[PDB]
Amino acid sequence: QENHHVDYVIRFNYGDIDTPEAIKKFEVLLLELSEVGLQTEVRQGDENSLFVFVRAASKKKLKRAVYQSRVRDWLYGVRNTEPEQSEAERLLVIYHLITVPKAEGGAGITPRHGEWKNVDAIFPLHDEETNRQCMREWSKKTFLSTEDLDRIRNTFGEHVGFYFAFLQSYFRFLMFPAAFGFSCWLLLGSFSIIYTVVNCLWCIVFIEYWKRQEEDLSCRWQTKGVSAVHEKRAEFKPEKERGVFPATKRMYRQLLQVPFALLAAVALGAIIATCFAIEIFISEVYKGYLVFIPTILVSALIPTMSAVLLTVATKLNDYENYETQDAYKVALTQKIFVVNFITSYLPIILTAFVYVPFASRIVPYLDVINPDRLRKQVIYFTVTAQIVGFALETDEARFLTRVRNEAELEDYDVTDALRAMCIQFGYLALFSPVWPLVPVSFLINNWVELRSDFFKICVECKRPWPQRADTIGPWLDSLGFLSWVGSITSSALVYMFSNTIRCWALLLTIFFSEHLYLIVRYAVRSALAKLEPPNTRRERIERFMMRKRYLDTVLTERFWMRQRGWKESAEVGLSLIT
Amino acid sequence: QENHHVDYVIRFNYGDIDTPEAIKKFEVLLLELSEVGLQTEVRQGDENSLFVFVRAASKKKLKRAVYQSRVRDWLYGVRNTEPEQSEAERLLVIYHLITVPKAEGGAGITPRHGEWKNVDAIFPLHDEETNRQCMREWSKKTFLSTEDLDRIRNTFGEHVGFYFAFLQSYFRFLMFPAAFGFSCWLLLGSFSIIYTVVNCLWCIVFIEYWKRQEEDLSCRWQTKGVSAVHEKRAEFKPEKERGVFPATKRMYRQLLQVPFALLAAVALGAIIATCFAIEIFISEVYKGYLVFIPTILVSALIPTMSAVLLTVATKLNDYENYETQDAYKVALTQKIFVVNFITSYLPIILTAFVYVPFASRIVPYLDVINPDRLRKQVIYFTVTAQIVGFALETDEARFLTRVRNEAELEDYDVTDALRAMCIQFGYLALFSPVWPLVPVSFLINNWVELRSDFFKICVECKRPWPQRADTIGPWLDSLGFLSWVGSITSSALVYMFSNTIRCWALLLTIFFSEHLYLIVRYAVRSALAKLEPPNTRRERIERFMMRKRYLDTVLTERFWMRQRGWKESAEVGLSLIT
């Protein structure tokens, strides 16, 4: 093939070790790779690092690897076939040959955690025929079929497959608010009740539909349940019998998220109040569109402030010392959600429920505010970042240098572009009745950046190892929390700013709209549970027939003496009736 | 033994058939019982009914029955051992031999549904040594050990076992509000905030603790997952390939619950308004405790009005034509919960939020109201029914007539005494801060009636066939809904009736108390998920070791030629570092 049958390539760096110490850690790595059935070949890489090439050493060793991985998947509950395939399947079982805890599988490699500090990251090689002769059919397509998502599952794994399927379903479901809000901008305007009810209905229906499509796609890609949690770079304090860490010592570090979030909220509310003060000063001392210059500056500085808070949250999450990857991911997603909620929505919350209604009590406290100010805030905080972001755009030595060019690329992260599609959903759920062209501005940006994720995953960063998944992650609970908060927030905004405040009716239409949201969400979930998707119905039919075939295969004392057999019992019965 | 090795006894009635028609249905029953390995013996019963006696016909047929039932339990997901025991286990596999759908198991008997109209109910025989030499150790005990619940699991099955464990845990958890409300009656009085917060905390903790004890007990009794749904007496319209019934035709009958519930609510609010009118008339035309006579009469007529609405709800649920038993049970529990919510709490809701605050606008509309009226209503609707209920109390022809006396008894129902323990929890969650002696009045009645369920299940009605369960049913969701409604209702009552109404603060302390309830419930659930019960930790340890033992048991082309083996690769590595 194009790649020289290479499954993986393992980069071992020696720029931080001695001359005689690196020759022992290299021999230990080669002996651990040769203890399992992996054939190794060493070549020179960069000026301080050499990489080895890992292949299946034989057909018998590869068959034993696939059988051991299928045994682990059947024992953990992923497989239900009691075992006795593709490119992603072979790459997954070879990555499980390299990187497991050595009690099963083998080779014990953890890339830069402990006792393997010299080796750098390991990675497979890019399928050139799949990211050249198929990447330029996916960018100029605008919509992907299920057989097209099968090609992004068979390469790059089910993790990338679920991420791209979620982006496709979100772009397909975004076409309804992008048409409806534009239809409710030429006809109804800002703060309309019809658009708010239909927008909250859409926010319910999209989440309850993707929750069904996830169970559809995890039964289609034969990955219906993944609870096989993996280890990490945990620093265990004791070693009592397995490394242990007390949860009471973890909660005392988990409580540090509260002062961090509170200080970030105060430090951003100070910037928002400063922007209000400079806007009032410019409105006093002169001016049409130039009076909202610091709001535009802080709305453009949002994505570089959230990154700083993201690095602080990553350091705080690494301090909390999690054991499993499926807990570190959940805690990181919770911290990213808190940071993005503080960063992206609280500038609009502080001008929707604090600044504009209590204008006469804070404007004299700032000088040393009609609802169009809130409309301009929702305009400036969902558009200008995307405007600025789209303004910065304006014999075998060939294979070895291709691999050396592939080792200098970045590493892909789903959790960076999936964070933005949560901020968009939070702007859609919470403050979208303020300006109904928020879905149009999101759909245009998504249609522009649709051909930017294929390019990124194909030519900009290296190929990820094929990771299995049954869901997009804990972002699907963040979407539900955003819809729940938006059902209160949009109803309060529509009451406060359509057409005194009558404070009993505001807290009545908060209560009734929240509980109507809960009732309608239960109804939509129970209605979508009834209708079964096809590729999880085929799996249920197959698992029913596989059980029915097996079941059809497998198929004092003188009182019980007066009626031998059953014909005598029938004779006693016929004598006893008459 | 005492019983003549009798597993089951099947009563066949002939009081409604002809003389020659009953001799064929009897022969069909005996042939269907003899097709499976069951030895039958016929004797005369009552003047229009004769019963047969069903035993395991051989050891090989009994072993085949246990193996087929274990195969069905392993295929449906109950068993995880891949098969190659007690009294309840033998009675369960013999009942599964008699009553299944004949595609598996055999004998096809459905007791009075279709093509078996002549046979009456079937039932096992009472273990006299277990309900005589052990029932008079359980009534005068007041508390049951786990080895004592094992005796009510090994007889009467896991359904009765979970019901008695729920009653024991509820009686043990009721001792804390029965002490705390009595401590908050000598010190604080009615409508106190401390008792309301602690009562809502107790309502959270009891439900989130029984949800953990259910997963404890279902892993202890080897019944951790039961999703093996059974058929029923469904009348299928078409027969397209299995009898089918469209859900769109079922929803049009399910919508009849709304006019039934609305008409019951209006018909009870009319009686409550009539009782208010007669109370105001007696208060005008004369009288200390006699002025609340119709309230006492309607509070005593509550349990005989809820029974009439229960029969209407049972007819409506049988009209809705459910296919599975695990859906008929859920819909019946929902209808019973709606009926009991209308019957037991809406008389207190109509005098807490309608009559007492708007007294000056309805008292002139009734004549042709201090919060002590609400306190007297909560007194009269949680006590006087229990007062009236506890005021109405003030050679082988011996075995055959014992069986004939056992066939005239009633049939046990868990869902009749488990309904009252939901009405008690609803009175505890919703209106208990009005009068803090509600938990004392419930604990005294529960301690009185604790020795009345053992008597009922042992000597008053016949022995149920051992039914398996993993939960008490869909009552555990009704308890959570009652706690959710009570977190709003008790906070509104404490704001309205402690020490103008200031209608913004009422709908503020509704909102904050409901969302504080949700936050604290999530915290209590996440804290109780951390702490693992012992008998589900032993099962997890066993399922981990059973997998670890099996896993330890089971364990272009010229580029891959320059380094044979791995020692040559280490030589190339040591040459390439230096």
Author numbering:
A (entry chain A), B (entry chain B): 11 to 94, 102 to 258, 268 to 312, 317 to 398, 421 to 446, 489 to 593, 604 to 659, 702 to 724
The authors write:
TMEM16 scramblases dissipate the plasma membrane lipid asymmetry to activate multiple eukaryotic cellular pathways. The TMEM16 superfamily is comprised of Cl- channels and dual function scramblases/non-selective ion channels. Our results show afTMEM16 thins the membrane to enable scrambling and that an open hydrophilic pathway is not a structural requirement to allow rapid transbilayer movement of lipids. Scrambling by the TMEM16’s is modulated by two signals, binding of Ca2+ facilitates opening of the groove while the properties of the membrane determine whether the scramblase can thin the membrane enough to enable lipid flipping.
